[PDB]
Each structure stands twice: as C-alpha cells, then as structure tokens.
Amino acid sequence: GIVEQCCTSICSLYQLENYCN
Amino acid sequence: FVNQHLCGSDLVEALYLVCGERGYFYTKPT
C-alpha cells in the first residue's frame, strides 16, 4: 500500500515512518 | 523531508533511510 500513497502520490515522513518498525 | 513521488527502490531507500536499523516492511504488492 505505501506504493500508492508515495508513487501515485507524494508521501509524508509520518506515512514513511509508519511502515517502519 | 522533501515532497517527491518516490517509486522503484527510491521509496524503499527512504525507509532504509528513515527506518535505518529499526527495520521496515516493504512488500504486499498492491
């Protein structure tokens, strides 16, 4: 899923850190 | 962080950056 928010659209560190342990 | 559409390994590299050694999960092909 992160692929859509970051590829089809720009993501925010909060979303990126969200997929991180 | 910058606001740019990441894809390919770029996106990963970011987590590899943000998560660093914390460990992240990238898969579940959408």
Short mmCIF file of N, CA and C in Angstrom, two decimals, chain B residues 11-26:
data_model
loop_
_atom_site.label_atom_id
_atom_site.label_comp_id
_atom_site.label_asym_id
_atom_site.label_seq_id
_atom_site.Cartn_x
_atom_site.Cartn_y
_atom_site.Cartn_z
N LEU B 11 11.73 4.82 -3.15
CA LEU B 11 10.81 4.72 -1.99
C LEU B 11 11.46 3.86 -0.90
N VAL B 12 11.85 2.66 -1.25
CA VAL B 12 12.50 1.78 -0.24
C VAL B 12 13.65 2.52 0.41
N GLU B 13 14.59 2.93 -0.40
CA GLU B 13 15.79 3.64 0.12
C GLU B 13 15.36 4.61 1.22
N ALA B 14 14.28 5.30 1.01
CA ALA B 14 13.80 6.24 2.05
C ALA B 14 13.57 5.44 3.34
N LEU B 15 12.71 4.47 3.32
CA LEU B 15 12.50 3.66 4.55
C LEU B 15 13.86 3.18 5.04
N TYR B 16 14.66 2.67 4.14
CA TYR B 16 16.01 2.21 4.55
C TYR B 16 16.71 3.38 5.23
N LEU B 17 16.31 4.57 4.88
CA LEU B 17 16.89 5.80 5.49
C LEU B 17 16.14 6.09 6.80
N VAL B 18 14.87 6.37 6.70
CA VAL B 18 14.03 6.66 7.89
C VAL B 18 14.16 5.53 8.91
N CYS B 19 13.87 4.33 8.50
CA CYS B 19 13.93 3.18 9.43
C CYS B 19 15.39 2.83 9.76
N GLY B 20 16.30 3.06 8.86
CA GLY B 20 17.72 2.73 9.16
C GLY B 20 17.81 1.31 9.72
N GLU B 21 18.32 1.16 10.92
CA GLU B 21 18.44 -0.20 11.53
C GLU B 21 17.13 -0.61 12.21
N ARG B 22 16.21 0.30 12.40
CA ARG B 22 14.93 -0.07 13.07
C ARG B 22 14.27 -1.24 12.34
N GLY B 23 14.43 -1.31 11.05
CA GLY B 23 13.81 -2.43 10.27
C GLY B 23 12.43 -2.00 9.76
N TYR B 24 12.18 -2.12 8.48
CA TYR B 24 10.84 -1.73 7.92
C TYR B 24 10.30 -2.89 7.09
N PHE B 25 9.08 -2.78 6.64
CA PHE B 25 8.46 -3.88 5.83
C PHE B 25 7.95 -3.31 4.51
N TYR B 26 8.47 -3.80 3.41
CA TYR B 26 8.03 -3.31 2.07
C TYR B 26 7.68 -4.51 1.19
#
